[PDB]
Each structure stands twice: as C-alpha cells, then as structure tokens.
C-alpha cells in the first residue's frame, strides 16, 4: 500500500508537473503562433511595401 | 503433486507414529520384564538365603 501509494503519488506528482509544464508549453506555442501571424503579416506587408 | 506430497507425509506420520507404539512394546518389555526380575530376584534371593 505504501509502495503503491508512494508510487501513485510520485506518478501523480510527475503527471501534475507535466500539466503545469504543458500549460507553459501549450501557451508558449500560442505566443509563437501569434508572432508568426504578426511576423508573416509584417513580412507580407513589408514585402508588398 | 504438491497437495499429494503434503498428504503423503500424513500417511507416513500415522505409520511412523503407530510404529512408535510397536517399538514401545519392546521398549516397555525392557522396563516391564526387567522390573519383574527385580521383584523376582528379590524373592529368589530371599528364598536362596
């Protein structure tokens, strides 16, 4: 029980860490995707300009 | 085989146990016959004297 509880808690902490890390990575792509749209729009606008 | 192996010891256990009573017969004879000799030797010694 302690080994399973400790292992379950350890796996839960690892999974919980991935959730917080996933949020940083999930939101990181949003800022990167928004920059691509802004950079591509500026590149297209600068190219046309 | 495992269950029969453990049960096999019960068969020999009863035989090894029942055999003890048979061996005790000869063992008791060494104590009963010898005890009778003491009572007989005491009377034989008194009768001899």
């Amino acid at each position: 029980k302690l080994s399973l509880s400790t292992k379950l808690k350890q796996v839960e902490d690892e999974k919980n860490s991935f959730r917080e890390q996933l949020e940083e990575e999930e939101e990181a792509k949003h800022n990167l995707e928004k920059q691509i749209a802004t950079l591509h729009a500026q590149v297209a606008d600068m190219k046309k300009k | 085989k495992g269950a029969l192996a453990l049960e096999e010891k019960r068969r020999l256990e009863a035989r090894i146990a029942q055999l003890e009573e048979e061996l005790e017969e000869e063992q008791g004879n060494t104590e009963l016959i010898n005890d009778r000799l003491k009572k007989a030797n005491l009377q034989i010694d008194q009768i001899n004297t």
Binding site: - | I16, A17, E20, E21, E22, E24, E31, L32
Partner: protein, 49 residues
Amino acid sequence: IILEDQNCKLAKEKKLLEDRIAEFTTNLTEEEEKSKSLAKLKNKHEAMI
C-alpha cells in the same frame, strides 16, 4: 489490472501459507510420535498391572 493485484496478493498468501504449514506440520511429527508413544505407555501399565 485487477487480476494483477489479486494474483500478486494470492502469491504472497500462498508463499506465507506454505511457510507457516511447515512450522505446524513439523510439530505434528513430534506430537504424533509423542501421542502414539503415550498410547502404548498406558498399555504398559495395564499389562504390568
């Protein structure tokens, strides 16, 4: 998954049961001989009586 936990539990119980059986079965051999030997002991007094 449920069978793994049940199989693992039965594995530890089966191992402890066999180990505990030897602790009690071993005493049965001494008790079997002592009990059977005591039976013939009572007959020795009857025969001697």
